[PDB]
Amino acid sequence: VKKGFRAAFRFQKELERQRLLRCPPPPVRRSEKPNWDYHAEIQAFGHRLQENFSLDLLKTAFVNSCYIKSEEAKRQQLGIVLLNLKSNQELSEQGTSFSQTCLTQFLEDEYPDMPTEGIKNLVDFLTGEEVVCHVARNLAVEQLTLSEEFPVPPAVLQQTFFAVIGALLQSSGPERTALFIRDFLITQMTGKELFEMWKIINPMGLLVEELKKRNVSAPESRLTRQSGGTTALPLYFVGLYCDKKLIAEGPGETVLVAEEEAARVALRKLYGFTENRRPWNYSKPK
Amino acid sequence: AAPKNRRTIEVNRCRRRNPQKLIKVKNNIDVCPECGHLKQKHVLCAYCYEKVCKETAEIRRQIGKQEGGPFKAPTIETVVLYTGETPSEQDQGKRIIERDRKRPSWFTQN
């Protein structure tokens, strides 16, 4: 036995760290965690977003129906109305509608040649659970979300995010909310492909339909480049020629894959979603 | 000749866990149709062999009790008779070994 207390304390702390690593604890709410003040968190959230959110509207948006039901159940269990808390269904509907309209208008303005199906699919991708939940988690909406179950379900998180959007629409008008949408949902298209967002099947048929609309002749697929045709690692570049004029070229491992890629490239060119297209203008409205 | 350096645990594992040094799986194990115990195809069943050995030891003890001395080998044949059995015409003229038990089913009186 050696005299000392500092070494024993440090080793006890290291042992506690090892025990935590061996038996990870289940996650808990940040509100349940110490150093929490809901009003200050709401105000700081508004200031970080740099927009004049109304406190009452924002709190009603963060209040969900499932939390209200859970609170009523807890009141019934405790035998205790004073829990007349508004749900965020109306704000969620308003925010969802305004966001859909704003995204549709922005996509129509930026890419006029995009068809209605493409615009709808892009709007659905931007308003889907993945993008909306990612944005909410990175904006700490999930921390302020009042939900019965932790972690917050993706549908509840999306509803809370759209309720926040609707509260912003009510508080600061439509233009500020449109700027917020442009800054926080349009940016999610960065580093994304048109067909990576909108998943299509049989691009050749869609290309043929577009050429029929534009009165272009039926495209002809021709092998432009070939390498290692009779090997295990072939490369093919197939070009689509309309009236002996090249409109797109696609590479692939087989002839069918190369032709499909060429059709996809032609569709991207027709819809204006080229890789070297003009970047989205994020400059302030002046 | 002394070793030059200590051999590492990696080399030791590679030597020890080689498939040649591992125990091979025996595929000749079968089931004895009589006693139901496991046996090899080319080896007699241990259960039945032990049973036969016990019976043979009892018979030899009775034979020695009848003989009652060393260097006493009968000049005639030997027949073992169990309870409720009488000497037969074949058994006539042969030394009779009396066993105080019922004849086993496997010990068919041929």
Partner: protein
């Protein structure tokens, strides 16, 4: 470890008896129901007189409610693994029977309803100062509905169901250490009638092995 060394001034103190003084005979056809009677009543009256002499503040007419409460509380102790309260509620002869086979099993039990009110059927007491302690035992009959669902160590259902209530008729014998100032009525044991129907079959299938055989031995029928 069976017995402490002899010639010791300190003797082992026992707060309960191994068995019943006289097992009450369960009437045949009692499930259907759900002179000698006078003699049994007189014996019960003698036992009640002894019990009241040792503790006047006692009522046989009110005992069955206390017995039912003790039964329910002891089974809830079985449910929630409250061994201290179970010890306070039952005797040392009864605790091992309840807790020995459920050490690594989950027991879920409830007391839904009582089909018939509990009735005292026999009261008897031990002889005067067997070891300086006089024990009184009361036999009660309960025709109630219970739910049982036992799970194994891995959380798999093993026997019974927690949802469907089933009729249970049972005789419970209670014992109290009258001489002990702090002694109280505790569940001593239960009596299974010979005519009682067998319990429900278990979920799993059990193989009963045949007689073991040595090499020199031969099987017999």
């Amino acid at each position: 470890l069976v017995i402490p060394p002899e010639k010791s001034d300190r003797s082992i103190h026992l707060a309960c008896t191994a068995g019943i003084f006289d097992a009450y005979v369960p009437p045949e056809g009692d499930a259907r129901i759900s002179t000698e009677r006078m003699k049994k009543t007189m014996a019960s009256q003698v036992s009640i007189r002894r019990i009241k002499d040792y503790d006047a503040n006692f009522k046989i007419k009110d005992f069955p409610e206390k017995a039912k409460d003790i039964f329910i509380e002891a089974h809830l102790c079985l449910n929630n693994s409250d061994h201290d309260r179970l010890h306070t509620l039952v005797t040392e002869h009864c605790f091992p029977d309840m807790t020995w086979d459920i050490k690594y099993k989950t027991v879920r039990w409830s007391f839904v309803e009582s089909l018939e009110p509990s009735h005292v059927v026999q009261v008897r007491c031990s002889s005067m100062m067997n070891q300086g302690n006089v024990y009184g035992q009361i036999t009660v009959r309960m025709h109630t509905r219970q739910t049982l669902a036992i799970y194994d160590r891995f959380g798999r259902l093993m026997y019974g169901q927690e949802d469907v209530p089933k009729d249970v008729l049972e005789y419970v014998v209670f014992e109290k250490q009258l001489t002990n100032p702090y002694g109280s009525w505790r569940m001593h044991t239960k009596i299974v009638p010979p005519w009682a129907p067998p319990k429900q079959p278990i979920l799993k299938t059990v193989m009963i092995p045949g007689p073991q055989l040595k090499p020199e031995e031969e099987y017999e029928e």
